[PDB]
Amino acid sequence: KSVDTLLIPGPIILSGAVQKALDVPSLGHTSPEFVSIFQRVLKNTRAVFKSAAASKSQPFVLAGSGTLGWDIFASNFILSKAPNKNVLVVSTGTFSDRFADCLRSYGAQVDVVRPLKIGESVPLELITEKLSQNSYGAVTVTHVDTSTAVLSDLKAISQAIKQTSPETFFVVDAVCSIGCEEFEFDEWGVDFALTASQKAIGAPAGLSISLCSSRFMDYALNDSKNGHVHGYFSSLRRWTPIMENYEAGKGAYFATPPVQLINSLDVALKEILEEGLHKRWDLHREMSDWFKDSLVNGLQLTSVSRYPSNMSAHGLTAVYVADPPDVIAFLKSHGVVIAGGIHKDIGPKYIRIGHMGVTACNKNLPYMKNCFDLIKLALQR
Amino acid sequence: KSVDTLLIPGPIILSGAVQKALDVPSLGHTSPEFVSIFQRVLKNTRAVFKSAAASKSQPFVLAGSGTLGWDIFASNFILSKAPNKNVLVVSTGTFSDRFADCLRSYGAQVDVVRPLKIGESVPLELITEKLSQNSYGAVTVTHVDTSTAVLSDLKAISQAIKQTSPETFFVVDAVCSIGCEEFEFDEWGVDFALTASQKAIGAPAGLSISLCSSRFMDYALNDSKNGHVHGYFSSLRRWTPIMENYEAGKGAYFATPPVQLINSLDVALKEILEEGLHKRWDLHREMSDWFKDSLVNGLQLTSVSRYPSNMSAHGLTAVYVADPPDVIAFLKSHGVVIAGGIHKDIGPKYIRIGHMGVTACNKNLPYMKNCFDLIKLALQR
Numbered sequence: 001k002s003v004d005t006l007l008i009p010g011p012i013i014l015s016g017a018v019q020k021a022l023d024v025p026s027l028g029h030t031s032p033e034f035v036s037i038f039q040r041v042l043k044n045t046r047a048v049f050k051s052a053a054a055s056k057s058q059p060f061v062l063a064g065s066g067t068l069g070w071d072i073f074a075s076n077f078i079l080s081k082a083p084n085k086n087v088l089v090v091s092t093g094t095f096s097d098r099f100a101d102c103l104r105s106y107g108a109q110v111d112v113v114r115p116l117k118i119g120e121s122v123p124l125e126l127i128t129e130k131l132s133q134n135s136y137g138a139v140t141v142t143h144v145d146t147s148t149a150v151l152s153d154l155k156a157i158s159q160a161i162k163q164t165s166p167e168t169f170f171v172v173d174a175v176c177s178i179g180c181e182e183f184e185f186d187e188w189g190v191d192f193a194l195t196a197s198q199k200a201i202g203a204p205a206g207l208s209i210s211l212c213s214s215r216f217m218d219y220a221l222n223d224s225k226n227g228h229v230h231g232y233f234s235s236l237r238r239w240t241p242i243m244e245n246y247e248a249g250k251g252a253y254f255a256t257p258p259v260q261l262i263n264s265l266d267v268a269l270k271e272i273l274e275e276g277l278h279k280r281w282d283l284h285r286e287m288s289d290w291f292k293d294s295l296v297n298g299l300q301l302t303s304v305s306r307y308p309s310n311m312s313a314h315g316l317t318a319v320y321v322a323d324p325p326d327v328i329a330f331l332k333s334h335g336v337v338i339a340g341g342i343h344k345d346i347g348p349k350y351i352r353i354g355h356m357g358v359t360a361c362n363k364n365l366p367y368m369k370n371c372f373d374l375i376k377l378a379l380q381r
Numbered sequence: 382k383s384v385d386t387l388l389i390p391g392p393i394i395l396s397g398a399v400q401k402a403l404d405v406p407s408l409g410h411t412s413p414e415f416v417s418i419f420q421r422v423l424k425n426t427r428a429v430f431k432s433a434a435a436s437k438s439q440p441f442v443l444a445g446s447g448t449l450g451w452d453i454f455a456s457n458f459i460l461s462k463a464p465n466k467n468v469l470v471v472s473t474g475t476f477s478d479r480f481a482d483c484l485r486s487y488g489a490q491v492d493v494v495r496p497l498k499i500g501e502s503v504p505l506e507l508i509t510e511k512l513s514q515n516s517y518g519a520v521t522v523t524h525v526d527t528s529t530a531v532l533s534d535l536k537a538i539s540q541a542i543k544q545t546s547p548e549t550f551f552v553v554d555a556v557c558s559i560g561c562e563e564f565e566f567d568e569w570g571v572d573f574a575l576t577a578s579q580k581a582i583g584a585p586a587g588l589s590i591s592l593c594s595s596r597f598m599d600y601a602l603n604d605s606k607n608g609h610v611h612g613y614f615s616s617l618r619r620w621t622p623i624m625e626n627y628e629a630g631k632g633a634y635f636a637t638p639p640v641q642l643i644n645s646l647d648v649a650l651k652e653i654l655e656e657g658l659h660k661r662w663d664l665h666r667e668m669s670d671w672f673k674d675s676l677v678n679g680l681q682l683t684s685v686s687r688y689p690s691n692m693s694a695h696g697l698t699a700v701y702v703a704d705p706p707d708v709i710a711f712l713k714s715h716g717v718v719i720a721g722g723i724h725k726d727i728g729p730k731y732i733r734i735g736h737m738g739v740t741a742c743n744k745n746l747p748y749m750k751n752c753f754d755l756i757k758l759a760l761q762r
């Protein structure tokens with residue numbers, strides 16, 4: 001027997017290079033050789049977000065998970081003397097909501113705008129409407145909500161913000177979009193974007209990867225004006241000098257970074273950048289279309305996210321099924337792991353499949369053809 | 382050429398088993414096989430702290446670094462309606478102080494008690510004195526401060542607390558003590574202990590490993606009384622159900638745990654437990670004595686921590702040297718990495734060496750004999 005094929009929306013299967021890049025002896029975090037690795041990582045992190053070094057945006061890579069990104073933004077936005085604590089949360093599913101929770105836990109007055117139906121993005125006009133009737137210090141959008149597998153139009157939302165409330169910070173939960181979905185940090189005027197290491201970036205789990213715009217960084221570190229951070233580990237003020245030195249190939253110290261994880265992430269970022277982001281987004285699209293096509297049209301199923309449509313993310317598939325547990329158990333027995341629903345409402349009414357990174361790209365891995373064949377067979381009983 | 386020999390106080394060299402335990406394909410975090418790994422890890426985590434399952438203490442293993450442990454304790458102690466926000470910090474070096482900072486950043490009124498001289502522990506009578514003239518909600522002690530390489534007598538301090546202020550929570554920063562220093566969670570009445578994965582535990586960097594006493598857990602989750610956590614990722618309230626299920630071999634989800642890191646930690650914990658904690662503490666002692674003996678007596682150097690004495694930790698050595706940079710550079714050139722000072726005062730006046738985990742135990746690794754030979758030669762010029 002072998003290891004099961006991971007086809008859930010994070011963690012995902014790692015390419016050989018990034019996986020064996022984990023099995024490496026420990027390096028001192030301030031050693032010249034580790035400093036080399038992290039420097040590349042920080043610069044490739046901004047690149048992967050589609051941010052130019054000239055934008056003066058500040059990248060942050062630290063031990064934690066995607067979720068840390070929420071704490072980081074909240075803790076650095078809702079400072080002690082925060083002038084505007086109102087945040088407007090654009091919800092497309094479970095994670096948007098959980099982000100809303102995190103926000104509130106930090107002292108932010110949160111407003112939630114939702115879609116007209118589950119599996120859809122929030123209407124743009126409703127977002128601008130909300131952006132007008134009130135003045136939010138920040139607005140969040142979950143680029144791809146993994147619970148509903150819904151894709152939000154960041155280009156549109158970013159323009160509505162620039163148009164209706166330019167001063168409000170544009171925060172994007174890109175955990176399940178960076179690496180497989182078109183995402184333009186600089187172009188779309190994103191102030192804070194956060195992603196994880198185990199989704200489309202194709203790295204091991206254990207890292208929080210976020211990026212700060214010059215504008216937000218300007219706000220976050222203005223102690224005399226906005227006050228201080230009610231926290232510590234998540235303090236941008238404390239980590240900036242560290243990320244700065246590392247990018248300058250200097251090496252300093254606040255909290256020991258995950259050397260093995262950073263080494264792995266180094267390879268993972270190179271791989272997505274060596275072949276090109278656009279190319280990598282197209283592969284995910286091709287994979288996603290073929291698969292939903294097979295599921296929705298081929299097996300006459302219904303997608304949780306509207307399909308076909310630009311509302312359906314390319315990093316995963318969420319399709320309703322009669323008996324999700326049975327389908328999941330069936331695939332499991334045959335060496336394939338897919339996921340359940342995780343959603344306050346439709347939770348046990350559907351299943352979720354991965355198809356990100358090497359499993360989406362790299363047309364030699366039969367992972368997905370086999371996945372579909374199995375689901376196909378699972379619905380036979 | 383080869384990889385340099387890591388002889389700094391964290392990260393440390395990993396044994397072959399735990400290192401290759403990193404290079405493993407990703408598992409779904411709720412998959413039966415991963416649930417198996419994490420369950421063992423959580424139970425061996427309490428074991429490694431010397432806590433009996435019967436104590437009902439709750440372990441926490443999450444993505445982050447030792448430093449997260451501070452945020453976790455602070456965030457869960459200084460709740461919204463915290464009845465006693467006063468914390469007494471027992472400082473033996475830089476980290477005690479930084480912990481003090483973290484504490485203040487979270488809203489705690491901190492008092493700092495220090496040693497009479499650098500390289501010494503704080504006098505016990507001064508601690509009880511301070512514990513009497515005021516009533517602290519909690520007191521922290523850095524079991525081994527890596528900046529000064531000082532060891533505090535937890536047995537003594539724990540009795541002074543039980544004696545002078547039993548209600549005050551006993552918090553221990555065990556980041557550089559668990560795995561190489563005698564540490565009794567249950568026996569000494571520790572309420573919150575935090576450690577990291579890269580020190581004496583001999584695991585890769587990237588995990589925060591802490592343990593909560595039934596008593597503290599009682600306080601931390603009493604929302605109606607003490608209020609809520611001003612935070613999210615560090616909320617014990619949010620992670621408890623997760624650690625609980627995992628220990629029950631159930632598997633649930635709050636924030637994706639570092640599957641590869643947990644797998645590695647699994648092996649690392651087994652190894653220290655398979656040979657026995659006491660045995661593992663003696664090996665560290667033997668190694669530490671031999672090495673400081675060689676440095677202090679052999680090369681007539683002066684330890685930053687009082688030596689010989691019970692104030693000198695066994696996980697590292699901090700010795701003053703004429704030209705630290707030169708000694709460090711010299712060792713580096715010959716494939717060995719030791720560290721600088723990191724201390725507000727004596728910072729550039731000394732060096733630091735590791736000797737923890739496989740490099741301290743496993744009497745086949747010539748790492749330390751060679752380290753000394755090199756320092757010996759470094760002082761020849």
Ligand SMILES: *Cc1c(COP(=O)(O)O)cnc(C)c1O
Nearest residue numbers: 255256446447448476527556557
């Ligand atoms: C190494 C160390 C820390 C910091 O641990 P990180 O893993 O770098 O966050 C905190 N306390 C002590 C006593 C240490 O030795």
Ligand SMILES: *Cc1c(COP(=O)(O)O)cnc(C)c1O
Nearest residue numbers: 065066067095146175176636637
């Ligand atoms: C997977 C995911 C998260 C949580 O990431 P962790 O790494 O589990 O903390 C947050 N947001 C979205 C949109 C996700 O898909």
